[PDB]
Amino acid sequence: SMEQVAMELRLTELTRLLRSVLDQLQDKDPARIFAQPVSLKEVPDYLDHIKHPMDFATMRKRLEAQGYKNLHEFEEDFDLIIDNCMKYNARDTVFYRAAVRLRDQGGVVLRQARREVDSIG
Ligand code: NA
């Protein structure tokens, strides 16, 4: 049907928007602490602590398979990256502090993206 194509045009434009959002958020991690999943070869107990690991590479695989139906889903994944980091790593570490910074800087970009999604549909 034609309706199915027009829903596919809107998912495709969302995905165009979220790719921009993602690259904007990844720029706020110039250290690349969050670019890849945490290694289970280097942190073998990681899954005893963190139940739903998340990272920018994993978000990008999903994004490009148009697996984010809306901004909420994409925000959930972003918060996992931050939120898991602040649990695994103690407050006085470069990792925890890097998360705090990404969260705060990320909040501006996400604040305007929720406006563009609402505005444009
Ligand atoms: Na902790």
Curated annotation (Swiss-Prot):
Cross-link (Glycyl lysine isopeptide (Lys-Gly) (interchain with G-Cter in SUMO2)): 41
Domain Bromo: 9-113
Tissues where this protein is expressed: Highly expressed in testis.
TM ranges: none
Subcellular location: Nucleus; Chromosome
Signal peptide: none
Quaternary structure, from the entry: Component of some HBO1 complex composed of KAT7/HBO1, MEAF6, ING4 and BRD1/BRPF2. Component of the MOZ/MORF complex composed at least of ING5, KAT6A, KAT6B, MEAF6 and one of BRPF1, BRD1/BRPF2 and BRPF3. Interacts (via PHD-type zinc finger domain) with unmodified histone H3. Interacts (via PWWP domain) with dimethylated and trimethylated 'Lys-79' on histone H3.
Function: Scaffold subunit of various histone acetyltransferase (HAT) complexes, such as the MOZ/MORF and HBO1 complexes, that acts as a regulator of hematopoiesis. Plays a key role in HBO1 complex by directing KAT7/HBO1 specificity towards histone H3 'Lys-14' acetylation (H3K14ac), thereby promoting erythroid differentiation.
Protein's name in the database: Bromodomain-containing protein 1
Protein's organism: Homo sapiens
Gene: BRD1
From-to range in the entire protein, with total length: 555 to 674 of 1058
